[PDB]
Design a protein around this ligand. Structure first.
Ligand SMILES: *[C@@H]1O[C@H](CO)[C@@H](O[C@@H]2O[C@H](CO)[C@@H](O)[C@H](O)[C@H]2NC(C)=O)[C@H](O)[C@H]1NC(C)=O
Ligand SMILES: *[C@@H]1O[C@H](CO)[C@@H](O)[C@H](O)[C@H]1NC(C)=O
Lengths: 49, 49
């Protein structure tokens, strides 16, 4: 290619990243976290430690 | 699919044989991977000069 700063729309360089997820039977390790909110004492509550 | 390595270390004063004592082994490292290993060797160190 001949990429130049004067190139118009559709001709300028564009950086592309493609993410593909694979689901092998091996244990999963790449996961998104969950927001741990806070702790409260002396009140009948429910918890997910 | 989990390689578990448990370890322990103790001080010894008797010369050769396994001491007649009891000491549990604490869990050290887990690996969530899967391989079909069936044979294991054991390495060594030497002085070369
Ligand atoms: C050996 O490894 C394979 C895969 O790494 C393990 O899983 C199955 O092995 C059998 C062998 O005929 C086949 O069904 C497939 O190759 C594998 N299936 C899947 C879903 O992975 C197998 O369990 C391992 N065996 C030992 C003794 O460790
Ligand atoms: C190894 O042995 C020495 C004395 O023999 C002792 O002081 C030390 O704590 C021991 N270390 C381990 C890890 O058992």
């Amino acid at each position: 290619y001949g990429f130049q700063p004067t190139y118009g729309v559709g001709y300028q360089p564009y950086r592309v990243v493609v993410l593909s997820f694979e689901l092998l039977h091996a244990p999963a390790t790449v996961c998104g976290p969950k927001k741990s909110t806070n702790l409260v004492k002396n009140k009948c509550v429910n918890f997910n430690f | 699919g989990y390689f578990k390595i448990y370890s322990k270390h103790t001080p010894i004063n008797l010369v050769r044989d396994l001491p007649q004592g009891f000491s549990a082994l604490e869990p050290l490292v887990d690996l969530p991977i899967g391989i079909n290993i069936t044979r294991f060797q054991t390495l060594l160190a030497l002085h070369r000069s």
